[PDB]
Amino acid sequence: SELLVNTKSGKVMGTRVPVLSSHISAFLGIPFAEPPVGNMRFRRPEPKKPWSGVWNASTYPNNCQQYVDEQFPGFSGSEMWNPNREMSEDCLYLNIWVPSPRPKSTTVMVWIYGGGFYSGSSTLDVYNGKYLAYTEEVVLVSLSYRVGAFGFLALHGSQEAPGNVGLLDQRMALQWVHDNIQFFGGDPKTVTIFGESAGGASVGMHILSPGSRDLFRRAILQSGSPNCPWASVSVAEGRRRAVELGRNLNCNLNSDEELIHCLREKKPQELIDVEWNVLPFDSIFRFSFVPVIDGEFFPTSLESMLNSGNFKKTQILLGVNKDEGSFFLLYGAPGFSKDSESKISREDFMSGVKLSVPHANDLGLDAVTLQYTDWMDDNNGIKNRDGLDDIVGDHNVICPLMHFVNKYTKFGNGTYLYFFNHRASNLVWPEWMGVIHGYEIEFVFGLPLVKELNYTAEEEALSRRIMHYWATFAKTGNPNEPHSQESKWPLFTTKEQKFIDLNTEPMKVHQRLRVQMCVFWNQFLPKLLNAT
Amino acid sequence: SELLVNTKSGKVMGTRVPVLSSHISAFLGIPFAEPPVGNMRFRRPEPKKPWSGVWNASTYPNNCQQYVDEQFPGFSGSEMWNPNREMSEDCLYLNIWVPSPRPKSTTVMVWIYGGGFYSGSSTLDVYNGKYLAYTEEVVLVSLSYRVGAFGFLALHGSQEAPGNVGLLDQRMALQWVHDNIQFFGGDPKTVTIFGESAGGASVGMHILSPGSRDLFRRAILQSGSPNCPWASVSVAEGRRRAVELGRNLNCNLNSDEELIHCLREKKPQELIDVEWNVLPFDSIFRFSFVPVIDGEFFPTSLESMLNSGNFKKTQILLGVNKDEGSFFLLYGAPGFSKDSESKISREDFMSGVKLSVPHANDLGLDAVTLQYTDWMDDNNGIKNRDGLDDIVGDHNVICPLMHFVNKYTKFGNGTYLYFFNHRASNLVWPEWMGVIHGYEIEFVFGLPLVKELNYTAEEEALSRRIMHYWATFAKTGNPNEPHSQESKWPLFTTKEQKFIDLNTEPMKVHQRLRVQMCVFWNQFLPKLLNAT
Numbered sequence A, B: 001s002e003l004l005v006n007t008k009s010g011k012v013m014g015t016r017v018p019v020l021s022s023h024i025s026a027f028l029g030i031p032f033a034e035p036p037v038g039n040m041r042f043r044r045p046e047p048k049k050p051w052s053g054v055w056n057a058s059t060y061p062n063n064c065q066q067y068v069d070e071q072f073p074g075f076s077g078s079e080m081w082n083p084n085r086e087m088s089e090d091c092l093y094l095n096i097w098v099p100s101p102r103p104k105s106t107t108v109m110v111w112i113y114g115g116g117f118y119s120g121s122s123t124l125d126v127y128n129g130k131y132l133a134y135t136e137e138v139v140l141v142s143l144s145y146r147v148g149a150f151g152f153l154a155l156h157g158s159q160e161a162p163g164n165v166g167l168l169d170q171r172m173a174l175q176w177v178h179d180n181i182q183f184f185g186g187d188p189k190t191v192t193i194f195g196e197s198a199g200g201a202s203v204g205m206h207i208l209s210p211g212s213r214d215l216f217r218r219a220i221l222q223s224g225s226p227n228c229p230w231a232s233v234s235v236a237e238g239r240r241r242a243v244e245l246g247r248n249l250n251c252n253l254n255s256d257e258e259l260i261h262c263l264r265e266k267k268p269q270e271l272i273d274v275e276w277n278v279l280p281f282d283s284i285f286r287f288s289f290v291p292v293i294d295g296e297f298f299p300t301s302l303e304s305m306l307n308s309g310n311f312k313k314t315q316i317l318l319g320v321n322k323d324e325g326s327f328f329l330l331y332g333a334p335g336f337s338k339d340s341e342s343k344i345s346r347e348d349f350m351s352g353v354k355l356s357v358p359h360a361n362d363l364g365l366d367a368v369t370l371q372y373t374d375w376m377d378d379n380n381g382i383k384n385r386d387g388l389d390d391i392v393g394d395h396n397v398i399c400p401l402m403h404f405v406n407k408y409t410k411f412g413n414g415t416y417l418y419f420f421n422h423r424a425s426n427l428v429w430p431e432w433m434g435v436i437h438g439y440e441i442e443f444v445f446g447l448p449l450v451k452e453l454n455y456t457a458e459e460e461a462l463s464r465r466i467m468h469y470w471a472t473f474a475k476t477g478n479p480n481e482p483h484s485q486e487s488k489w490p491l492f493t494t495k496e497q498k499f500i501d502l503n504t505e506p507m508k509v510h511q512r513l514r515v516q517m518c519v520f521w522n523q524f525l526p527k528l529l530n531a532t
Ligand SMILES: CCC1=C[C@@H]2Cc3nc4cc(Cl)ccc4c(N)c3[C@H](C1)C2
Pocket: A069, A077, A078, A081, A082, A114, A115, A116, A119, A197, A327, A429, A436, A437, A438, A439
């Protein structure tokens, strides 16, 4: 049977699913680790014990325990990201979509969901892998990993809660794909990992970490980089936040052993209820439990690893969206609202800068303000709103990604960079937010091909072009079909630094993506904060 | 006789001079102070002892002792600024041009020449007052004052070389105009002082100094402000430079008395020969002997005087030229030449920034570089050259003037601001220099009306418009003729900050002159240098 597959862990039975007037196979909810429960909370994951009999893989698994967005009850724009299955600490599973008839040895793509390391699910409608598996004939895998305190509480030095276990969850799933994907028709030697937001930062972290490098061939990073300011903390800050978490739950703080034991007795929701109380500053785009520079998963600081070429050398495809910051401002900065144009007063602009660069002294805040203020028209509410949008986006996503791409390209074997700036015609979010953090995903997964979703014919064409770029890149290390007649996406080089836009217009090549602002964020400001 | 005038100091006999196919009277070289020679070198000036008989005022007086420009031997562009009469320490004289027939009580304009406080003459062709006196029917006066060490050597605390004596020379001439101009047909109650460069900074210094305020009615400042970074030094820096000067001349440095005595025995040229050796930094647009914040001529710091409204309140007319910096770069920055387009390499750009902001630490230099660099095209030699031109001009002339105008306007009775950007058609300097520091003067003095000088008809029209704005402002406190039909030069207000361009095109009103760069130079950079 096409739906029965014998793996090294046991047999699994999939289900046949319809997709664009055809069908493919889906193996949903396959376990790749022992449930990280009880005394296992906060610990490194354990390989799943093999099972006898047939594992029913016809339905989605539970989603990991996480903060749930209730800012706009009943609004699809936000609820489409919330867990759509029951939440449970028993959540370490993966899903595989396989072309029918089953391939023999074809290209594999493994998706790592984003969510600031505090949320995310592999079961979201926007992550349905059937369109991509079917359309590009690839075996599509989506893994899962612990988020929040469950995946990143870090008390360095202890082996009960070492930190980074969420990253090790991802690695175990990559190990399982390496060991078993051949039985589903996939080529374990041609696996591409790709992810968005924290998922994109994660991809970069597997490129850096010696322990993950051998488990994949190529990588794709969307709106996220390993070196992002929100993606990691020192072991000292991680410890401080773990202790403060315990303090919020009235735990004994005498020893790591005492703290961990207390935290392990709490119910999932008790930890989630006070999770946000441990941040050190009043800020936006900062999350409580994230990866830690431990000296193990990451041998040394991320910057020295990038400088020395201490990372996997291969081809990478990566990029960002036009208005990465709007989402965060809507949710956490004064003056921004879902139902108004959100024109910003000079007073709220100033409040916003402060929330955006939480780690800056007054001279630093003045430097940022001057860089983004048009002093010939300083009370223009639209410029203030858009200036703040760029500040958040440049500081948190674009400039860190540009620094990573320039450092990687020096030692890598091929880089392809994009700038996604198409605003979907059926977007439910207000116009002021523009091209939002996370909204290129639906085009990567081919949702515009589904007629009932209401995209335009041009949007379907764009989605097809993107899916083919991604899949062709996974298969060959180049998004372009060599002998084709279509416009070519040039290679990004240290010298020319070329990139392309991704929208419904005719391809256009540019150079030095937001270079002026990124020299400010990557060279000047850091130097100013260190001097002062 | 129209050419004989009885003043409180004695009788003077002028000469009749032709001007634009007509005639007026000129009284050249009238003494207003005792010769500041011998043991008087470095001392405050003394009123001229009255004389019996008739003082011959038919020819120009000597020019004060000064550094002479020999950078382009035989080139008119530079020699037109050099002393055109014999140099001598006996140089405290003034010149008066009087309409014929002699007025009874008409508007008076007193010109104060510029030259970085180290050079200048009242006898230059470009300062010939006959065109303005004749055309606008004003009594035009040009005074003189000591420059270099002779006018500004400062050993605070000593009464032999107190500092600021060059400014007191200007004041004595203003006192003489106040006391005697009535006899030449001028109204001592309607005297306007105007000057360019250090002359413009001087005008502002008389507005500030309690001891000078009562001696004039209104003021005009061209390309210079009292608060300019090159216009004054602290008493400590003044002292340090006076001692270093003595050190260059192998003087006894045991006491002020010993130093001054030695300096007084040296010949004028010995002091001029080592004058430039006392600057504290490798720089451009910095001069050795300038006014000192002494607590006497200037009661407190210039900034606190501006902030408290401690200054003469009246109307002022002032402005700047488009490319104030080109002159200084040509003469002192690597990569700039008179006979080439001077495209600047990134290496010379960096050298240039360093010479332009001599007082900056590395973080400050990086801030300036980022502010003026286009990172999408950083090796464009024309942008590097022009960026450097703006840096020198904004830092040294424009932004200091904009700060002064914004502080003055709060307490003043009327402000009119201009931006002169017309490049003369007969300019002998290369095109890359643009509209040069000092080249609006020829239009203020009406040289374009002289056919043989070869300006265009449009340039003659522009000169006439400027002469009429200046003279009408001196006469009424407003450059506009109220009931006229011509385009109106609006008042600069704290709120609207309007200004006009001065060129051959139809008047155009703008707002917030170089506001973006000036917030950088007046608020951010100073704050960065103080924090670091
Ligand atoms: C950084 C957090 C995060 C990042 C990814 C992109 C993302 N984008 C969102 C945009 C809006 Cl406006 C509202 C809700 C959103 C959301 N829950 C997500 C999720 C969560 C995935």
